[PDB]
Design a protein around this motif. Structure first.
Motif: not given
Ligand code: HEM
Ligand code: HEM
Ligand code: HEM
Ligand code: HEM
Lengths: 141, 146, 146, 141
Positions: D42, D45, D58, D61, D65-66, D83, D97, D101, D132
């Protein structure tokens, strides 16, 4: 969750099940026990032999439970409240087993409804079963 | 992959009856329909908006064939699935970036299609044997991920 | 196992500093507390009412030692965990009826306990190696299920 | 299904996290990537190398969110709506996944807040993160 389309699919397909539901329920359990043996840890007090009356009997109960959820498709959470408690609080069945049983239901139907088991009905039934499972394990941990 | 002589036989007898062109199209097609998230991998396949768009898509049927063919090889080397699939495994990881979880999905769908095609012939035990194989193939494709 | 000599070194050197009395009791206690479902297997232990009942239960703490004790052996025979956990596997299956899914739970609770206790020493890489071990143990315990 | 007591533990644990949310945020990703490499599928990039800016940026970010979900522990569905779309519809991240985390979030807190990482707090954070995850994987198909 379940779209109007999904509900018609489910209603229709379970519609075709009709009188066999019970026997499809038992078969599904059997497939479960055979393909994924960890599931039997929940039924140590059962006779799991081929043709076992407990299974046949159990299959009926499950079948009925699904017909009832079909019948109250708009209020599953409440229609299944009781079973939700039994499973999550008394039986305390781990959620994954639910995915295993659903898989096995889909196989059974598949084997039994060549005609009805189209891609779209398959997707619907899947979603549906996902829903029942979700209700049954909401209160688990 | 505790494939006994008899499961081995079971598995092989039936695969003999499969029309790979056919089952492979069904199998990949139903995967894109039942679990729409997987369509993110096939943005090049054109229209996948509805079940007809998907199931009748000639690119899906073509691809569906490739896939079932690889599968067929595996069945020919049930004793060396890791070696048989090492290169497919690096590809899906390194080039495609496919979460290996998706392999479990295809495996289950594939079993529904066998049941669907074989009906009554697709008995519990036969089902039992095939679940081992698909599990085995999914593990084998997942093995070179790093 | 998919344990690298440097990984083995890793796991080994850390375990060597482990206080079995405290970690053992804590990993089990925390299992009963974080995942209340599991309590259904330790009814004979008594009062599992509250976090404090659990953490103070001496049947709990003692059992937690038996358990880390078996873990310690596994680490002594990392080349044959299946061989090492076969009997205990049969037991958990045939006698206790524990869904192997719980092994995973316990496995994750131990990692949190080690991180708890070791802090900065429990690094990403070190964590990574233990993830493989707990997974291996889980796997080994699940093996004689039928 | 958080109890008022869970909501409280969560509130306290996270209160101690303070200005370190980002660092913890980043560390948990790092551990995930290392401990469960398929999760890297995932982020093709990204520079996933030790202490990368990307991973670092990252981590922040995610930590934000938490913090944000803590604050709205009572209105998660709504605070995390945006989100939720991204993860379940745009990224289409498989649900499993999430448990990886979470596990790593807990591992990091355990290592950094030894005084606070009590059994009760531990259980409370586990339910929170599970919660969450549910909101975030809500509309996944
Ligand atoms: C507690 C669970 C999670 C939270 C609070 C969370 C939160 C976030 C936040 C705040 C963003 C930023 C998007 C933006 O720029 O507006 C994001 C993007 C993203 N999240 Fe999560 N996420 C969680 C779980 C996951 C998991 C388990 C995966 C993959 C295994 C994942 C994959 C991604 C990816 C690939 C992006 C885009 C990255 C990028 O292009 O910068 N997330 N997530
Ligand atoms: C589609 C999902 C399921 C449905 C509709 C369902 C339905 C039912 C029903 C109607 C009963 C009978 C209780 C009564 O009214 O007396 C029952 C009991 C039970 N179920 Fe489920 N169930 C489901 C999933 C599962 C799974 C996945 C497992 C374990 C792998 C399981 C294990 C049990 C056990 C152990 C009992 C009680 C056995 C006994 O009678 O001694 N169920 N379930
Ligand atoms: C039995 C499991 C599978 C087998 C045996 C298999 C086999 C193959 C083969 C033989 C190829 C062509 C290799 C090449 O082009 O060099 C391929 C490509 C590909 N596979 Fe798989 N595959 C499997 C499952 C999956 C799944 C579940 C996904 C994603 C959900 C996936 C995603 C892809 C993609 C995106 C391509 C490239 C297609 C293109 O754009 O031309 N595969 N696979
Ligand atoms: C990899 C993880 C585990 C290991 C190494 C392990 C090991 C052991 C050991 C060494 C015993 C001693 C019994 C004897 O020697 O007669 C035991 C008993 C037992 N195990 Fe496990 N176990 C594990 C996970 C679990 C889990 C997750 C559960 C349930 C949630 C469980 C349920 C039990 C029970 C109920 C007993 C018997 C308790 C008693 O005698 O009162 N085990 N296990």
């Amino acid at each position: 969750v379940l779209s109007p389309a999904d509900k018609t699919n489910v209603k229709a397909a379970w519609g075709k099940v009709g009188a066999h539901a019970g026997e499809y329920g038992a078969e599904a359990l059997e497939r479960m026990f055979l393909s994924f043996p960890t599931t039997k840890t929940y039924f140590p007090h059962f006779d799991l032999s081929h043709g076992s009356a407990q299974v046949k009997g159990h299959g009926k109960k499950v079948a009925d439970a699904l017909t009832n959820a079909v019948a109250h498709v708009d209020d599953m959470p409440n229609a299944l409240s009781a079973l939700s408690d039994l499973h999550a609080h008394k039986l305390r069945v781990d959620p994954v087993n639910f995915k295993l049983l659903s898989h096995c239901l889909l196989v059974t139907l598949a084997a039994h409804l060549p005609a009805e088991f189209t891609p779209a009905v398959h997707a619907s039934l899947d979603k549906f079963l996902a829903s029942v499972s979700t209700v049954l394990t909401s209160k688990y941990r | 992959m505790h494939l006994t002589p008899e499961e081995k036989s079971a598995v092989t007898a039936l695969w003999g009856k499969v029309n790979v062109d056919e089952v492979g199209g069904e199998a990949l097609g139903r995967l894109l329909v039942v679990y729409p998230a997987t369509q993110r991998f096939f943005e090049s396949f054109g229209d996948l908006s509805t079940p007809d768009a998907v199931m009748g898509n000639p690119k899906v049927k073509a691809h569906g064939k490739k896939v079932l063919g690889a599968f067929s090889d595996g069945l020919a080397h049930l004793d060396n699935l890791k070696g048989t699939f090492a290169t497919l495994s690096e590809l899906h990881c390194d080039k495609l970036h496919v979460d290996p979880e998706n392999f479990r999905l295809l495996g289950n769908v594939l079993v529904c299609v066998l049941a669907h095609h074989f009906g009554k012939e697709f008995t519990p035990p036969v089902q039992a044997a095939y679940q081992k194989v698909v599990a085995g193939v999914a593990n084998a494709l997942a093995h070179k991920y790093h």
